[PDB]
GROMACS .gro file of C-alpha atoms in nm:
model
  432
    1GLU     CA    1  22.350   3.111   9.038
    2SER     CA    2  22.135   3.355   8.780
    3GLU     CA    3  21.904   3.026   8.722
    4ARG     CA    4  21.817   3.043   9.145
    5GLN     CA    5  21.768   3.406   9.129
    6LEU     CA    6  21.570   3.384   8.810
    7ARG     CA    7  21.292   3.110   8.951
    8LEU     CA    8  21.296   3.304   9.308
    9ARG     CA    9  21.206   3.596   9.109
   10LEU     CA   10  20.897   3.409   8.922
   11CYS     CA   11  20.805   3.313   9.266
   12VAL     CA   12  20.776   3.649   9.383
   13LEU     CA   13  20.581   3.736   9.068
   14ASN     CA   14  20.361   3.414   9.087
   15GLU     CA   15  20.290   3.492   9.494
   16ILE     CA   16  20.197   3.876   9.422
   17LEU     CA   17  19.961   3.797   9.147
   18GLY     CA   18  19.800   3.507   9.322
   19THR     CA   19  19.766   3.651   9.668
   20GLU     CA   20  19.626   3.986   9.485
   21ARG     CA   21  19.353   3.743   9.326
   22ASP     CA   22  19.267   3.650   9.680
   23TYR     CA   23  19.273   3.986   9.815
   24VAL     CA   24  18.985   4.119   9.527
   25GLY     CA   25  18.821   3.768   9.629
   26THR     CA   26  18.821   3.919   9.947
   27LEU     CA   27  18.718   4.242   9.903
   28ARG     CA   28  18.445   4.091   9.650
   29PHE     CA   29  18.311   3.866   9.932
   30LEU     CA   30  18.220   4.164  10.192
   31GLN     CA   31  18.012   4.365   9.939
   32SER     CA   32  17.798   4.109   9.882
   33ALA     CA   33  17.757   3.889  10.149
   34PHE     CA   34  17.682   4.214  10.394
   35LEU     CA   35  17.691   4.577  10.166
   36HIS     CA   36  17.506   4.496   9.890
   37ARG     CA   37  17.256   4.232  10.078
   38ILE     CA   38  17.151   4.463  10.345
   39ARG     CA   39  17.101   4.749  10.096
   40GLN     CA   40  16.847   4.510   9.896
   41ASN     CA   41  16.601   4.375  10.162
   42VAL     CA   42  16.613   4.672  10.438
   43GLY     CA   43  16.896   4.408  11.267
   44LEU     CA   44  17.172   4.606  11.087
   45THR     CA   45  17.124   4.945  11.070
   46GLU     CA   46  17.252   5.187  10.767
   47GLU     CA   47  17.490   5.384  10.949
   48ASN     CA   48  17.570   5.090  11.104
   49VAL     CA   49  17.730   4.938  10.773
   50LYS     CA   50  17.895   5.288  10.709
   51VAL     CA   51  18.075   5.235  11.027
   52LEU     CA   52  18.194   4.901  10.997
   53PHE     CA   53  18.289   4.846  10.673
   54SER     CA   54  18.351   5.245  10.578
   55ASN     CA   55  18.508   5.285  10.156
   56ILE     CA   56  18.570   4.906  10.128
   57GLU     CA   57  18.385   4.945   9.809
   58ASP     CA   58  18.602   5.225   9.676
   59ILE     CA   59  18.929   5.010   9.775
   60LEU     CA   60  18.749   4.690   9.573
   61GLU     CA   61  18.730   4.947   9.256
   62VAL     CA   62  19.144   5.056   9.266
   63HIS     CA   63  19.253   4.702   9.354
   64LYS     CA   64  18.996   4.552   9.092
   65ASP     CA   65  19.204   4.758   8.832
   66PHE     CA   66  19.502   4.672   8.968
   67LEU     CA   67  19.492   4.318   8.931
   68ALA     CA   68  19.420   4.409   8.562
   69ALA     CA   69  19.761   4.534   8.529
   70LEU     CA   70  19.905   4.283   8.709
   71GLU     CA   71  19.774   3.997   8.448
   72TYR     CA   72  19.843   4.226   8.201
   73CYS     CA   73  20.247   4.230   8.247
   74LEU     CA   74  20.186   3.894   8.348
   75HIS     CA   75  20.010   3.735   8.031
   76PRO     CA   76  20.023   3.490   7.930
   77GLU     CA   77  20.216   3.368   8.238
   78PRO     CA   78  20.483   3.488   8.471
   79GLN     CA   79  20.768   3.523   8.301
   80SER     CA   80  21.085   3.664   8.422
   81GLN     CA   81  21.142   3.966   8.152
   82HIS     CA   82  20.785   4.090   8.284
   83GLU     CA   83  20.808   4.392   8.476
   84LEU     CA   84  20.573   4.495   8.698
   85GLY     CA   85  20.728   4.800   8.858
   86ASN     CA   86  20.542   5.058   8.677
   87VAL     CA   87  20.199   4.912   8.793
   88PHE     CA   88  20.275   5.021   9.141
   89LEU     CA   89  20.398   5.339   9.041
   90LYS     CA   90  20.094   5.426   8.832
   91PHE     CA   91  19.835   5.338   9.090
   92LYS     CA   92  20.046   5.483   9.423
   93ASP     CA   93  19.828   5.806   9.386
   94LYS     CA   94  19.523   5.583   9.400
   95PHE     CA   95  19.641   5.432   9.745
   96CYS     CA   96  19.504   5.735   9.910
   97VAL     CA   97  19.165   5.551   9.950
   98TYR     CA   98  19.338   5.365  10.261
   99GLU     CA   99  19.296   5.663  10.450
  100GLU     CA  100  18.933   5.690  10.542
  101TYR     CA  101  18.930   5.306  10.589
  102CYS     CA  102  19.228   5.313  10.804
  103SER     CA  103  19.119   5.620  11.016
  104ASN     CA  104  18.718   5.435  11.100
  105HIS     CA  105  18.918   5.157  11.168
  106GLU     CA  106  18.944   5.186  11.567
  107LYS     CA  107  18.543   5.314  11.539
  108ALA     CA  108  18.445   4.999  11.319
  109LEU     CA  109  18.593   4.775  11.621
  110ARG     CA  110  18.416   4.922  11.882
  111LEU     CA  111  18.085   4.900  11.733
  112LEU     CA  112  18.115   4.537  11.643
  113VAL     CA  113  18.205   4.512  11.955
  114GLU     CA  114  17.875   4.610  12.103
  115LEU     CA  115  17.691   4.455  11.829
  116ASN     CA  116  17.832   4.098  11.896
  117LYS     CA  117  17.648   4.167  12.262
  118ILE     CA  118  17.326   4.137  12.109
  119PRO     CA  119  17.241   3.798  11.988
  120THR     CA  120  16.999   3.876  11.696
  121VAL     CA  121  17.282   4.089  11.519
  122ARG     CA  122  17.560   3.851  11.616
  123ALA     CA  123  17.359   3.615  11.445
  124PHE     CA  124  17.263   3.799  11.158
  125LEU     CA  125  17.680   3.884  11.053
  126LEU     CA  126  17.747   3.536  11.107
  127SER     CA  127  17.442   3.478  10.843
  128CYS     CA  128  17.598   3.658  10.627
  129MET     CA  129  17.907   3.490  10.595
  130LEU     CA  130  17.734   3.164  10.597
  131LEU     CA  131  17.551   3.285  10.262
  132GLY     CA  132  17.785   3.430  10.093
  133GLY     CA  133  17.979   3.063  10.070
  134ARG     CA  134  18.245   3.135  10.334
  135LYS     CA  135  18.303   2.909  10.640
  136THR     CA  136  18.183   3.070  10.927
  137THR     CA  137  18.438   2.883  11.165
  138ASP     CA  138  18.725   2.988  11.017
  139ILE     CA  139  18.824   3.382  11.020
  140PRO     CA  140  18.586   3.617  11.204
  141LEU     CA  141  18.474   3.916  11.033
  142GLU     CA  142  18.748   4.158  11.301
  143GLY     CA  143  19.017   3.934  11.072
  144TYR     CA  144  18.772   4.049  10.762
  145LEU     CA  145  18.726   4.378  10.829
  146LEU     CA  146  19.158   4.428  10.907
  147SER     CA  147  19.294   4.267  10.564
  148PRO     CA  148  19.297   4.569  10.391
  149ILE     CA  149  19.526   4.693  10.658
  150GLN     CA  150  19.792   4.377  10.609
  151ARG     CA  151  19.733   4.386  10.220
  152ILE     CA  152  19.864   4.740  10.218
  153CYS     CA  153  20.163   4.652  10.425
  154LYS     CA  154  20.239   4.344  10.238
  155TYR     CA  155  20.301   4.548   9.968
  156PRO     CA  156  20.608   4.667  10.096
  157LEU     CA  157  20.745   4.305  10.203
  158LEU     CA  158  20.679   4.165   9.876
  159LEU     CA  159  20.825   4.415   9.639
  160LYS     CA  160  21.181   4.410   9.886
  161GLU     CA  161  21.216   4.074   9.781
  162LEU     CA  162  21.127   4.085   9.418
  163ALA     CA  163  21.393   4.365   9.409
  164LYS     CA  164  21.637   4.136   9.580
  165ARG     CA  165  21.559   3.862   9.262
  166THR     CA  166  21.570   4.154   9.028
  167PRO     CA  167  21.908   4.244   8.875
  168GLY     CA  168  22.037   4.587   8.807
  169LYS     CA  169  22.038   4.422   8.402
  170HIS     CA  170  21.703   4.420   8.443
  171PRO     CA  171  21.474   4.686   8.309
  172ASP     CA  172  21.233   4.701   8.573
  173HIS     CA  173  21.546   4.771   8.855
  174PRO     CA  174  21.467   5.147   8.878
  175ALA     CA  175  21.106   5.073   8.887
  176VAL     CA  176  21.091   4.794   9.148
  177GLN     CA  177  21.304   5.011   9.362
  178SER     CA  178  21.120   5.350   9.317
  179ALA     CA  179  20.798   5.160   9.371
  180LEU     CA  180  20.937   4.976   9.719
  181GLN     CA  181  21.021   5.352   9.843
  182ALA     CA  182  20.677   5.486   9.750
  183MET     CA  183  20.509   5.190   9.868
  184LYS     CA  184  20.675   5.258  10.200
  185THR     CA  185  20.620   5.618  10.188
  186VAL     CA  186  20.223   5.524  10.167
  187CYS     CA  187  20.234   5.337  10.486
  188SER     CA  188  20.430   5.567  10.693
  189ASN     CA  189  20.185   5.837  10.581
  190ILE     CA  190  19.909   5.606  10.734
  191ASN     CA  191  19.911   5.577  11.119
  192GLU     CA  192  19.701   5.270  11.135
  193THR     CA  193  19.948   5.113  10.893
  194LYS     CA  194  20.250   5.212  11.019
  195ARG     CA  195  20.237   5.063  11.362
  196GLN     CA  196  20.171   4.726  11.125
  197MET     CA  197  20.448   4.762  10.889
  198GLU     CA  198  20.647   4.781  11.210
  199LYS     CA  199  20.539   4.500  11.387
  200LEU     CA  200  20.584   4.285  11.059
  201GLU     CA  201  20.946   4.469  11.038
  202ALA     CA  202  21.011   4.290  11.356
  203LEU     CA  203  20.884   3.945  11.248
  204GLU     CA  204  21.093   3.987  10.908
  205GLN     CA  205  21.387   4.122  11.104
  206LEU     CA  206  21.440   3.874  11.330
  207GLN     CA  207  21.388   3.587  11.050
  208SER     CA  208  21.697   3.792  10.873
  209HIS     CA  209  21.899   3.701  11.226
  210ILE     CA  210  21.843   3.316  11.215
  211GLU     CA  211  22.023   3.118  10.972
  212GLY     CA  212  21.890   2.815  10.742
  213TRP     CA  213  21.523   2.904  10.792
  214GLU     CA  214  21.334   2.644  10.694
  215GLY     CA  215  20.938   2.652  10.667
  216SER     CA  216  20.643   2.938  10.617
  217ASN     CA  217  20.735   3.328  10.673
  218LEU     CA  218  20.675   3.461  11.037
  219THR     CA  219  20.488   3.724  10.819
  220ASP     CA  220  20.231   3.507  10.724
  221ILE     CA  221  20.195   3.299  11.002
  222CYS     CA  222  20.242   3.500  11.349
  223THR     CA  223  20.129   3.831  11.398
  224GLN     CA  224  20.403   3.923  11.697
  225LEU     CA  225  20.709   3.805  11.905
  226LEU     CA  226  20.538   3.694  12.254
  227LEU     CA  227  20.865   3.550  12.451
  228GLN     CA  228  21.231   3.509  12.370
  229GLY     CA  229  21.458   3.351  12.607
  230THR     CA  230  21.738   3.104  12.621
  231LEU     CA  231  21.672   2.728  12.767
  232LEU     CA  232  21.766   2.424  12.769
  233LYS     CA  233  21.681   2.133  12.543
  234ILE     CA  234  21.665   1.791  12.694
  235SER     CA  235  21.574   1.596  12.403
  236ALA     CA  236  21.679   1.245  12.347
  237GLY     CA  237  22.035   1.193  12.325
  238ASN     CA  238  22.084   1.589  12.263
  239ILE     CA  239  22.110   1.801  12.609
  240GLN     CA  240  22.209   2.114  12.443
  241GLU     CA  241  22.093   2.475  12.506
  242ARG     CA  242  21.839   2.642  12.279
  243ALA     CA  243  21.728   2.950  12.192
  244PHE     CA  244  21.326   2.935  12.191
  245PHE     CA  245  21.097   3.225  12.031
  246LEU     CA  246  20.736   3.162  12.089
  247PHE     CA  247  20.550   3.349  11.872
  248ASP     CA  248  20.157   3.353  11.817
  249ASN     CA  249  20.074   2.994  11.646
  250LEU     CA  250  20.444   2.879  11.637
  251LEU     CA  251  20.695   2.837  11.850
  252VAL     CA  252  21.097   2.801  11.717
  253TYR     CA  253  21.415   2.668  11.909
  254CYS     CA  254  21.722   2.781  11.733
  255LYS     CA  255  22.100   2.721  11.805
  256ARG     CA  256  22.275   3.077  11.941
  257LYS     CA  257  22.589   3.132  11.782
  258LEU     CA  258  22.247   3.566  11.532
  259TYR     CA  259  22.091   3.214  11.566
  260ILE     CA  260  22.106   2.920  11.359
  261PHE     CA  261  21.764   2.755  11.292
  262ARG     CA  262  21.717   2.389  11.453
  263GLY     CA  263  21.322   2.338  11.468
  264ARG     CA  264  20.987   2.481  11.502
  265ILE     CA  265  20.639   2.356  11.636
  266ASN     CA  266  20.294   2.457  11.519
  267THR     CA  267  20.169   2.618  11.865
  268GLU     CA  268  19.842   2.369  11.760
  269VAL     CA  269  19.993   2.026  11.783
  270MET     CA  270  20.221   2.156  12.077
  271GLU     CA  271  20.097   2.029  12.409
  272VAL     CA  272  20.301   2.134  12.776
  273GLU     CA  273  20.324   1.961  13.112
  274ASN     CA  274  20.523   2.078  13.402
  275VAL     CA  275  20.762   1.870  13.571
  276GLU     CA  276  20.806   1.933  13.980
  277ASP     CA  277  21.177   2.024  14.060
  278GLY     CA  278  21.329   1.680  14.127
  279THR     CA  279  21.184   1.495  13.892
  280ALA     CA  280  21.381   1.253  13.703
  281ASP     CA  281  21.169   1.029  13.354
  282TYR     CA  282  21.301   0.899  13.039
  283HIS     CA  283  21.219   1.237  12.829
  284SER     CA  284  21.437   1.416  13.079
  285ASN     CA  285  21.758   1.140  12.965
  286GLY     CA  286  21.791   1.048  13.339
  287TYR     CA  287  21.902   1.402  13.511
  288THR     CA  288  21.716   1.537  13.749
  289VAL     CA  289  21.507   1.840  13.625
  290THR     CA  290  21.461   2.194  13.832
  291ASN     CA  291  21.246   2.500  13.694
  292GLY     CA  292  21.183   2.275  13.378
  293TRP     CA  293  20.902   2.168  13.197
  294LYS     CA  294  20.813   1.969  12.922
  295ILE     CA  295  20.648   1.969  12.560
  296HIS     CA  296  20.503   1.758  12.342
  297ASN     CA  297  20.422   1.738  11.987
  298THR     CA  298  20.139   1.568  11.954
  299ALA     CA  299  20.204   1.512  11.591
  300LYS     CA  300  20.471   1.330  11.620
  301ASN     CA  301  20.431   1.202  11.976
  302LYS     CA  302  20.773   1.367  12.040
  303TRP     CA  303  20.825   1.466  12.366
  304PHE     CA  304  21.117   1.682  12.488
  305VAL     CA  305  21.234   1.865  12.798
  306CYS     CA  306  21.291   2.266  12.855
  307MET     CA  307  21.449   2.398  13.170
  308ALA     CA  308  21.522   2.769  13.259
  309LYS     CA  309  21.747   2.918  13.476
  310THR     CA  310  21.539   3.073  13.752
  311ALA     CA  311  21.196   2.967  13.840
  312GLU     CA  312  21.037   3.312  13.739
  313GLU     CA  313  21.169   3.236  13.407
  314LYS     CA  314  21.005   2.938  13.419
  315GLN     CA  315  20.679   3.100  13.515
  316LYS     CA  316  20.739   3.346  13.251
  317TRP     CA  317  20.745   3.108  12.974
  318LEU     CA  318  20.452   2.857  13.114
  319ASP     CA  319  20.212   3.173  13.130
  320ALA     CA  320  20.293   3.287  12.834
  321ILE     CA  321  20.267   2.942  12.641
  322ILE     CA  322  19.912   2.919  12.840
  323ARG     CA  323  19.794   3.221  12.729
  324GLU     CA  324  19.875   3.164  12.345
  325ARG     CA  325  19.687   2.851  12.402
  326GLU     CA  326  19.347   3.010  12.583
  327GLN     CA  327  19.290   3.328  12.307
  328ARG     CA  328  19.340   3.073  12.021
  329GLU     CA  329  19.109   2.801  12.139
  330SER     CA  330  18.844   3.034  12.290
  331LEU     CA  331  18.852   3.225  11.988
  332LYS     CA  332  18.837   2.906  11.778
  333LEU     CA  333  18.568   2.761  11.991
  334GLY     CA  334  18.391   3.076  12.054
  335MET     CA  335  18.300   3.103  11.627
  336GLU     CA  336  18.250   2.735  11.636
  337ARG     CA  337  17.958   2.779  11.917
  338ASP     CA  338  17.860   3.114  11.786
  339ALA     CA  339  17.757   2.971  11.460
  340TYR     CA  340  17.563   2.650  11.555
  341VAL     CA  341  17.315   2.859  11.756
  342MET     CA  342  17.223   3.058  11.387
  343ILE     CA  343  17.215   2.720  11.230
  344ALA     CA  344  16.952   2.579  11.461
  345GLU     CA  345  16.785   2.875  11.499
  346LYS     CA  346  16.713   2.954  11.133
  347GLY     CA  347  16.641   2.597  11.132
  348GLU     CA  348  16.381   2.576  11.359
  349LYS     CA  349  16.260   2.878  11.229
  350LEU     CA  350  16.295   2.794  10.852
  351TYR     CA  351  16.095   2.489  10.981
  352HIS     CA  352  15.814   2.635  11.110
  353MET     CA  353  15.780   2.897  10.870
  354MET     CA  354  15.760   2.607  10.579
  355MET     CA  355  15.479   2.436  10.789
  356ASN     CA  356  15.200   2.739  10.765
  357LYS     CA  357  14.952   2.621  10.485
  358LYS     CA  358  15.020   2.957  10.315
  359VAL     CA  359  15.337   2.800  10.160
  360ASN     CA  360  15.293   2.385  10.204
  361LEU     CA  361  15.658   2.256  10.095
  362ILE     CA  362  15.684   1.962  10.329
  363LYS     CA  363  15.421   1.732  10.156
  364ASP     CA  364  15.445   1.329  10.126
  365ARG     CA  365  15.552   1.261   9.768
  366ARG     CA  366  15.623   0.953   9.598
  367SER     CA  367  15.704   0.435   9.661
  368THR     CA  368  15.587   0.693   9.884
  369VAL     CA  369  15.837   0.953  10.081
  370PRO     CA  370  15.685   1.147  10.358
  371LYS     CA  371  15.710   1.506  10.514
  372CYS     CA  372  15.978   1.552  10.242
  373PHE     CA  373  16.022   1.883  10.079
  374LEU     CA  374  16.222   1.987   9.686
  375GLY     CA  375  16.565   2.130   9.729
  376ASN     CA  376  16.439   2.346   9.390
  377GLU     CA  377  16.145   2.460   9.574
  378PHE     CA  378  16.287   2.552   9.932
  379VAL     CA  379  16.568   2.794   9.751
  380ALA     CA  380  16.291   2.933   9.581
  381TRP     CA  381  16.046   3.025   9.856
  382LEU     CA  382  16.378   3.202  10.028
  383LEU     CA  383  16.431   3.411   9.724
  384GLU     CA  384  16.024   3.476   9.725
  385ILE     CA  385  16.014   3.556  10.100
  386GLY     CA  386  16.329   3.737  10.076
  387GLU     CA  387  16.555   3.547  10.318
  388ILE     CA  388  16.858   3.539  10.048
  389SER     CA  389  16.936   3.759   9.729
  390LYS     CA  390  17.070   3.484   9.512
  391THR     CA  391  17.054   3.105   9.459
  392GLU     CA  392  17.377   3.043   9.549
  393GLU     CA  393  17.322   3.178   9.891
  394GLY     CA  394  17.022   2.945   9.902
  395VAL     CA  395  17.232   2.598   9.836
  396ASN     CA  396  17.472   2.769  10.094
  397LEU     CA  397  17.188   2.793  10.380
  398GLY     CA  398  17.074   2.427  10.265
  399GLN     CA  399  17.413   2.242  10.264
  400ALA     CA  400  17.490   2.442  10.634
  401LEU     CA  401  17.140   2.287  10.750
  402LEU     CA  402  17.239   1.952  10.612
  403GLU     CA  403  17.579   1.952  10.763
  404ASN     CA  404  17.486   2.065  11.078
  405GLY     CA  405  17.176   1.761  11.155
  406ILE     CA  406  16.914   1.996  11.072
  407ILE     CA  407  16.816   1.843  10.723
  408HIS     CA  408  16.901   1.546  10.499
  409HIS     CA  409  16.846   1.357  10.234
  410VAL     CA  410  16.575   1.101  10.223
  411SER     CA  411  16.839   0.870  10.133
  412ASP     CA  412  17.148   0.966  10.290
  413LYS     CA  413  17.248   0.966   9.933
  414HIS     CA  414  17.294   1.322   9.848
  415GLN     CA  415  17.402   1.640   9.931
  416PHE     CA  416  17.177   1.965   9.881
  417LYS     CA  417  17.153   2.109   9.535
  418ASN     CA  418  16.930   2.305   9.383
  419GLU     CA  419  16.767   2.007   9.185
  420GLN     CA  420  16.409   1.836   9.285
  421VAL     CA  421  16.602   1.643   9.504
  422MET     CA  422  16.372   1.545   9.818
  423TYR     CA  423  16.497   1.646  10.142
  424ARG     CA  424  16.331   1.581  10.488
  425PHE     CA  425  16.390   1.744  10.820
  426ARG     CA  426  16.552   1.567  11.084
  427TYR     CA  427  16.266   1.624  11.318
  428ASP     CA  428  15.994   1.458  11.104
  429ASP     CA  429  16.209   1.117  11.097
  430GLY     CA  430  16.287   1.138  11.458
  431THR     CA  431  16.685   1.124  11.373
  432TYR     CA  432  16.722   1.503  11.546
   0.00000   0.00000   0.00000
């Protein structure tokens, strides 16, 4: 099985590199979309930025060199002979940059909650993420502000797995084990990361007590266990008692023996339905249901019935299941509502701003095309007027206007580009 422990090591190496790359990119997005753009065109005060982002720029400079040494050891590719323990050890002292950030984290969130109450500041914050390239309906800024705390806690989890796939023969063995101990002591010193590490430890401890795990690791999809309990899975032809675990974003049912993995469901495709005590239907295999409900895997269009011992447990479960749905569905729908309002606002604003003869850009050009403007001119005018800083920001803005039904190509055959492609506001041609 030596080759098994080999490909397994490379997967760890490939992951450490690929995840570190996406981390630095996330840091490089936070400064360009936020810290840099406001430090140029000076409703977000300077103190507001210092509170929200703290030393995120110092964290970047550290991880910009970490990634270099990571790619340095893993050149030309992630090869098994390559050693990575020394890298973590010679950056172990530089990781104290997380001290100030994790301290200011609570204060930053408190500010963000009050800033999001102001509609103009919420829109500006969301406008920064749009211009920076990243989608606004995906991860909220609260999550971006936390990813430093998450990343520094993902290092012990990654090094542990690497140490498992690294034999005592490999010269990196004394270093990987020494680096794992050092990375743990880093997180343990900081209070904010200590709470995070113990929350990730719980997810991984549970996954270790489950045999035959299939799918993505809990530490990569969930954050906390919501409810655990043993129920009856009256699936078609299989009425067996199962141990159910409800996390955020995932539900998994196991076979109690420690547990043995049986199946898992993503809560996004899960739809529950109550069955009154005394009901008997096909999903219950004909048996009378008491203190039970019904689950529907809308991905597979499969229904299966759960039953609890007490009616308290039924309510305890049904209540916890509804909460998870509402919590994530409110966030998602909320980010998607607060993002349409800024585009509609900026769309109507830039329309009237462009209609004035000071910078007339929606001119009837030529067959004649009425009330059209040029993408090249539009992007340039945005930088002149100061609404954007880079040109990549201008196309990201125009595309968001095209996608959100504000503008469109004259022939609806092109997306937004910095070329002299003619676009028109959907107001002028009655398509709004």
